[PDB]
């Protein structure tokens, strides 16, 4: 599994610039595909999304009508068309395969990221908390808050924690509030009920510093939350 | 001024008529409850070309109990639809009946076609039956319900029917009141070209292709196709051939006279018989039926 | 040659007549015992209210 | 309203493409021709598939001819009990069963008075009357034909068919034996036998099994379509 | 004059 | 020989001691103790869920141990993994012989294994990181076709042939670990108990043995059907399993008295067993037949309790949840139906 993504620069503001991202060792026809871009020294922002056969396509309100996702299957591309670039989309943008089964993993493996620079109703997931000192050895619990119930009917409770390792992508820890994510060893941990969840890492060890950020997955416009770093 | 007599037909020729129209009932009866109960006693057997046979079926079945009824009272001993609603009724379901026996014919006809060139392509399913019988009701439907508001039974007084019993009802004609008169030869015109025009150039040139391709025990499916074909024309055509003579020939007083006493039961007598002659056609030659 | 197939046909019937047989009676009783002791936790045997059908219409 | 999460909304338009897939393969599938292969030991059934084109399981060859695409499924590896599998067979579209001609002097392995011919007829019997296969067709091959001929000269067919009546020369003796393969049919309205002698070149008999399934083709088609 | 037999 | 007659007369006095310690042992039979218990109701289900898109006869299906998750092989090529709640096709793993006679899943959920004509049980990673699933082994040697697989933990299935021999597979290496042998026919359907230390199989010769996985060898061994057995599974408890065979009969087999329990048989069927599975609790017998419906019995007391009457043609497969909240009947008219009772 490798996601490649190229086409960043530094972009006249009202200009236009086409994102890439080939995708290796995976079937890329069977994963629906993401845009996830986090501005300098900011949370992540969830951009576009196109599912696998390119039968539903959504966008964000901050980039519809300017940004367009497409994927070419057979050679195994996805892009990310931009126009009218302004001083608001300068991030570093990843490429976040996803696949939606009974049981599935979404959102499981993301890019390495891209940077651009433009030279000048939706649920709230809140993490009050945005800076926990931590010590090797102790447990660390970090809270989070959504404005609606992430519940659904099913019994699903739609919650993704994901870390951000300094100078890396993100990857998935939890995914649905309580599954742990493959490669993730057995010291997280999440819980929670309707609205209010926390993740406890017991035993905390270095290379775990970094921002975790909570993510919905409830309604298709995707919140993520302002970040909770660990610093040791 | 006029007093004629209820009872049209002389003895011998009415008792030869009602017997006829007995044999015409009980195959038609007799024919298509068979067929609905061999077809609705298997589910495994439900296929869509089956289903075809069920709505032939039904349509051959309402033809019985409209149609031969209702004309051949018209003129046998009568000489005059009742009330003014049941004209209307009558009229409508015979219509309705028979262009839903003709275009079942060409929907059969048509899904052979699919079964025979294009086995998996164009693969109609149960859905295709849906719609194609919904289709055939809809234009049965439709391509009557101008015909269904010029249904007007005509008041035609100082005319008589004094029987042996002396029987005293004015008489009526049930006609077809247009706003103008050309308007029904213009109906009677493209009647004619949707019931034994289209359908039967659809039904000759299908069959056609079909023994074509299947001439390269095959000749016998020749001879049933060229047999069914042939019947549709020959046992169809003098019903219209007659109905357009009176319609836009309008013959004269001694011919009409002839056509209204004696030429029209024959051709009704004709046009009846293809309902009872489907279900030992389309039934006992289909073999799967008789494997059934 | 079938000698040693008579062999091992000999001793698979000596293995299996010395197993340890109770009476019947005894079988059908422990039968009917976990029969009736899992009753009312059979979901075919006694239906459950359509609220706690996972199948449900 | 819908009451779908996007992840039940994502799932059920995975399972829709899956459908989609699933129709396209079986449209394909269904765009061909599936044989059965059988016949005894040494029956020349590998002679046959070699003409035409690790485990004892199943063999399936597949092979083009004239724009017809054909999976012909070599069984004869199978030693269990056949009414165990054989209903596995039911919509194959003919069954191509070869005997071998020579085999009417050679007794079998066992030597007990059970002709290898008598063993091919009992193994015809048996499959065409069998209740899965009352509308498949049969092509029967009668192969070796050539060999058949040469070995026709000293003994005659008196040594398996003690009521032969006929000269022992080679036509009227193949087509007596060809007679008789094609009288084990109790079936002779439902399927049809379509008896050929395998030649050196490859092309008459792929000629002729192309012909006899397209025949097949369009009689079960005739079926389906109310006629015959 | 507009009496007619009864169509099909 | 004279040795070889020998041999044949000790072995007809072992089968006729064994006999006798068996009728020594039947004393009551069960249906005269549960005569004085109160029979069920009719047991009436409706089709919750029907299972479409095989494009074949479907010939083995199995539930998944999480009662929600089930695989189905249809001899179509394809194996379609089935969330049996909202009927969606989370999986369609295309085969590479598609005359496909078995399927199993894992316990654990991560693997898939199915066999047939081609006398290989290939098993399939379903968790795999490039989002598809393939085949993580393919066991061969077995010379004949495959009749059943079972799976007993992520590395070990033990499998049924129609070579007469039933064979415990360790999946990392592709080798046969035992072999269990014995069986004078075809064998075509095992069942593990419980706690996978014992397995039943039942085979053509109308017997039913049961094996030791652990040992090798054949514990015990169960007659008395009159034709092929082709299809068998144990009672929860683990003491008991029922076998269906062509015969037209169901019997329940117990393991401890080595005997008949009781025969599940109506006059008005004659068409053979082609699946059986037991109740959560073990009270009800669910059979499927040819005459394309499956029958319901009272597993205590051999009466008809309820038919499951919704198949064009005959029920193959059959399945009860781990929890007992469904049965699934597979069938060769391309369908799966899931059932449940009312309230």
Excluded at chain 4, 40 to 52: N, R
Aim: aromatic share 10%.
């Amino acid at each position: 599994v490798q996601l490649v993504e190229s086409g960043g620069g530094l972009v006249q503001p009202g200009g236009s610039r086409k994102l890439s991202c080939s995708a290796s060792g995976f079937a890329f026809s069977s994963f629906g595909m993401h845009w996830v871009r986090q501005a300098p020294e900011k949370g992540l922002e969830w951009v576009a999304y196109i599912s696998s056969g390119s039968g539903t396509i959504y966008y964000a309100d901050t980039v519809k009508g300017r940004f367009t996702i497409s994927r070419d299957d057979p050679k195994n591309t996805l892009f990310l068309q931009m126009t009218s670039l302004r001083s608001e989309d300068t991030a570093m943008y990843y490429c976040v395969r996803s696949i939606y089964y009974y049981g599935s993993s979404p959102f499981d493996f993301w890019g390495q990221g891209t940077t651009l620079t433009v030279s000048a109703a939706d649920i709230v997931m809140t993490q009050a908390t945005s800076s926990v000192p931590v010590t090797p050895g102790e447990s660390v619990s970090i809270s989070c808050r959504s404005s609606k119930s992430l519940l659904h009917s099913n019994g699903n409770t739609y919650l993704y924690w994901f870390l951000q390792r300094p100078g890396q992508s993100p990857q998935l820890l939890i995914y649905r509030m309580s599954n742990l994510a493959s490669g993730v060893p057995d010291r997280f941990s999440g819980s929670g009920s309707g609205t209010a969840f926390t993740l406890t890492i017991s035993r905390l060890e270095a290379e775990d510093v970094g921002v975790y950020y909570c993510m919905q997955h409830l309604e298709y416009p995707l919140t993520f939350g302002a970040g909770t770093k660990l610093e040791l | 001024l006029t007093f004629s007599s209820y009872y049209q037909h002389t003895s011998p020729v009415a008792a030869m008529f009602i017997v006829a129209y007995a044999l015409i009932f009980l195959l038609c009866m007799v024919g298509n409850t068979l067929v609905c109960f061999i077809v609705l006693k298997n589910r495994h057997m439900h296929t869509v070309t089956n289903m075809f046979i069920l709505n032939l079926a039904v349509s051959d079945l309402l033809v019985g109990i409209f149609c031969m009824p209702t004309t051949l009272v018209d003129n046998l001993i009568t000489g005059w639809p009742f009330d003014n609603a049941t004209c209307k009724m009558s009229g409508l379901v015979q219509g309705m009946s028979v262009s839903a026996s003709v275009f079942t014919l060409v929907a059969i006809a048509v899904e052979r076609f699919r079964c025979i060139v294009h086995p998996f392509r164009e693969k109609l399913t149960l859905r295709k039956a849906l719609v194609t019988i919904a289709v055939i009701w809809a234009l049965a439907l439709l391509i009557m319900c101008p015909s269904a508001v010029t249904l007007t039974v005509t008041r035609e007084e100082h005319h008589f029917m004094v029987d042996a019993r002396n029987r005293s009802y004015p008489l009526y004609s049930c006609w077809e009141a247009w706003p103008e008169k050309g308007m029904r030869r213009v109906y009677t015109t493209v009647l004619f070209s949707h019931i034994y025009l289209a359908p039967l150039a659809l039904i000759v040139v299908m069959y056609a292709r079909i023994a074509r391709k299947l001439c390269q025990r095959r000749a016998r499916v020749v001879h049933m196709l060229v047999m069914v074909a042939l019947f549709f024309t020959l046992s169809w055509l003098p019903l219209w051939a007659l109905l357009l003579l009176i319609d836009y020939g309008q013959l004269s007083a001694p011919q009409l006279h002839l056509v209204t006493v004696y030429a029209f039961p024959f051709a009704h007598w004709l046009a009846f018989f293809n309902s009872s002659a489907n279900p030992i056609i389309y039934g006992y030659f289909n073999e799967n039926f008789r494997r059934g | 040659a079938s000698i040693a197939q008579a062999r091992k046909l000999v001793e698979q019937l000596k293995m299996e007549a010395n197993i340890d047989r109770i009476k019947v009676s005894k079988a059908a009783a422990d039968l009917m015992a976990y029969c009736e002791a899992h009753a009312k936790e059979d979901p075919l045997l006694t239906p459950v209210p359509a609220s706690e059908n996972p199948f449900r219409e | 309203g819908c009451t779908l999460s996007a992840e039940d909304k994502a799932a059920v338009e995975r399972s829709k493409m899956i459908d989609r897939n699933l129709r396209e393969d079986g449209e394909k599938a269904a765009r061909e021709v599936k044989l059965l292969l059988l016949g005894a030991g040494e029956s020349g059934k590998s002679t046959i598939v070699k003409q035409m084109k690790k485990t004892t399981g199943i063999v399936e060859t597949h092979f083009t001819f004239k724009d017809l695409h054909f999976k012909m499924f070599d069984v004869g590896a199978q030693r269990s009990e056949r009414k165990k599998w054989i209903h596995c067979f039911e919509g194959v579209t003919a069954i191509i069963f070869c005997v071998a001609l020579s085999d009417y002097d050679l007794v079998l392995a066992e030597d007990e008075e059970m002709n290898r011919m008598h063993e091919s007829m009992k193994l015809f019997d048996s499959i065409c009357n069998n209740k899965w296969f009352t509308d498949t067709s049969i092509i029967l091959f009668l192969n070796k034909k050539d060999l058949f001929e040469e070995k026709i000269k000293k003994s005659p067919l008196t040594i398996c068919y003690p009521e032969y009546a006929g000269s022992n020369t080679y036509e009227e003796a193949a087509a007596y034996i060809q007679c008789q393969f094609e009288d084990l049919n109790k079936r002779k309205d439902t399927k049809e036998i379509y008896t050929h002698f395998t030649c050196s070149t490859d092309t008459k008999n792929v000629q002729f099994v192309f012909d006899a399934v397209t025949d097949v083709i369009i009689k079960n088609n005739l079926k389906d379509c109310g006629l015959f | 004059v507009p009496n007619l037999p009864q169509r099909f | 020989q004279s040795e070889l007659d020998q041999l044949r007369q000790e072995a007809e006095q072992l089968k006729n001691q064994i006999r006798d310690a068996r009728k020594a042992c039947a004393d009551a039979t069960l249906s005269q103790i549960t005569n004085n218990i109160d029979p069920v109701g009719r047991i009436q289900m409706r089709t919750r869920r029907t299972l479409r898109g095989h494009l074949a006869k479907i010939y083995a299906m199995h539930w998944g141990t999480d009662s929600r998750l089930l695989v189905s092989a249809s001899q179509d090529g394809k194996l379609i993994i089935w969330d049996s709640y909202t009927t969606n096709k989370v999986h369609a793993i295309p085969l590479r012989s598609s005359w496909v006679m078995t399927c199993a899943y894992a316990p654990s959920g991560n693997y898939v294994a199915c066999g047939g004509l081609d006398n290989i049980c290939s098993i399939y990673n379903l968790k795999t990181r490039e989002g598809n699933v393939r085949v993580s082994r393919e066991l061969a040697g077995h010379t004949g076709y495959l009749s059943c697989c079972r799976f007993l933990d992520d590395n070990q299935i033990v499998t049924s042939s129609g070579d007469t021999t039933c064979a415990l597979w360790d999946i990392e290496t592709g080798q046969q670990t035992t072999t269990f042998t014995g069986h004078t026919g075809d064998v075509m359907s095992l069942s593990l108990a419980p706690d996978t230390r014992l397995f039943v199989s039942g085979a053509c010769d109308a017997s039913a043995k049961l094996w030791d996985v652990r040992e090798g060898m054949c514990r015990q061994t169960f007659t008395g059907h009159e034709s092929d057995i082709n299809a068998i599974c144990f009672f929860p408890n683990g003491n008991a399993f029922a076998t269906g065979s062509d015969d037209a009969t169901c019997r329940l087999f117990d393991l401890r008295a080595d005997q008949e329990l009781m025969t599940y048989s109506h006059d008005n069927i004659i068409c053979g067993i082609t699946s059986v599975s037991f109740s959560k609790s073990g009270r009800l017998l669910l059979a499927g037949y040819d005459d394309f419906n499956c029958n319901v019995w009272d597993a205590l007391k051999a009466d008809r309790a309820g038919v499951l009457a919704g198949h064009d043609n005959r029920v193959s497969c059959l399945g009860v949840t781990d929890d007992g909240m469904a049965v699934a009947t597979g069938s060769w008219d391309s369908f799966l139906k899931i059932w449940n009772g009312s309230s």
